[PDB]
Design a protein around this ligand. Structure first.
Ligand SMILES: CCN(CC)C(=O)c1ccc(O)c(OC)c1
Ligand SMILES: CCN(CC)C(=O)c1ccc(O)c(OC)c1
Lengths: 207, 207
């Protein structure tokens, strides 16, 4: 298990997300679904000139898996996935510069819901989750598990768990007062409201 | 000079853009600026683990260059640029699937301004231009010039013109009745309206 420190600006972004009074929390799902869409676009583009890219899995889609027992909402995609380097480098984002722009925007009247426009939408997972676990598999690497409960550090380990084939799995360990996001009609409402133009199937699992 | 046929679905997207009565043409600039932002994000991300990626040019920005003599509006960025393969493969887009989703959306009430959400925003250049020339330079290839006046075909040639260092240059040969997009206050208005959260400098050249 390797423990790393977040870059200062990312710890601050996470602190802002966690600490700010801000009711419109539901947007975390749209931001995660959108990152999944972007990863799927990437593998699909690569497959256009190299069909073998899809050897690790031909279907391009997203599953939403609520689990009330464990209190987790899981967002799985079969997109391009991430290498160990992508994971350590702020999950494939340009987070330092994105955080800088987001902060300026907030100072000038933007609100937290606009986070995705600064390319750090992943971190909005902290609006609802106390701990976030990311399992990922890229064609060019082995499966890894990234994890953080914020607090300025994250871990990375080689994942021994069930093999994924290819893609990214975001496991949200939901805060005690955010269990509405495990409820079927609430998830369906949010998907329909914010993710109506996502070009891949989104399957909501039932329990 | 190599001449290629557009895939059928792209020729149809272009025909739709060109033929539909649709007044809100100004959005082409926001879509091009946004593609440039995405290319810049890409090179910046690569530079995070490999500083030499920026050997071909350290500054990450966008220039807007109107030229009333030639009737061209040029959008230059110093982003990641495109290889010959990217160019032939619909300028690095997943255009067939993106066109499919855009068409469905239009049929269900979307309008042309939402084109960028389907990842084929580049083609909105045809709302204002009769011919579009794209000059591009990727670290992994030499400089190329892609060109199309629609009509179902595009060309690709190795570019002999002034060397770019790295990035993408979109030269819009504007339609005779679209010269307002060469006017300073009109360009400035559009940038301010639609591109206020682009995290790179956008320099509007004067003539
Ligand atoms: C670098 C590839 N990538 C992003 C396009 C993913 O696999 C990915 C998918 C979903 C996410 O929520 C995510 O969080 C950042 C990353
Ligand atoms: C594949 C890299 N890329 C797109 C991210 C560009 O260089 C690029 C930049 C501006 C554009 O208008 C464009 O048109 C599609 C492409």
């Amino acid at each position: 298990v390797e423990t790393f420190a977040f870059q200062a600006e990312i710890a601050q972004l996470m602190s802002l997300i966690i600490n700010t009074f801000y009711s419109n929390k539901e947007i975390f799902l749209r931001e995660l679904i959108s990152n999944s869409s972007d990863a799927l676009d990437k593998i699909r583009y690569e497959s256009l000139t190299d069909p073998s890219k899809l050897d690790s899995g031909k279907e391009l889609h997203i599953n939403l898996i609520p689990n009330k027992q464990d209190r987790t909402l899981t967002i799985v995609d079969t997109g391009i996935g991430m290498t160990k380097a992508d994971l350590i480098n702020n999950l494939g984002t340009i987070a330092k510069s994105g955080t800088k722009a987001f902060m300026e925007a907030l100072q000038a009247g933007a609100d937290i819901s606009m986070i995705g426009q600064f390319g750090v939408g992943f971190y909005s997972a902290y609006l609802v989750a106390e701990k976030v676990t990311v399992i990922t598999k890229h064609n060019d690497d082995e499966q890894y598990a990234w994890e953080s409960s914020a607090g300025g550090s994250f871990t990375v380990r080689t994942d021994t768990g069930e093999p994924m084939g290819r893609g990214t799995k975001v496991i949200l360990h939901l805060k005690e007062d955010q269990t509405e996001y495990l409820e079927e009609r609430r998830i369906k409402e949010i998907v329909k409201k914010h993710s109506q133009f996502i070009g891949y199937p989104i399957t909501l699992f039932v329990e």
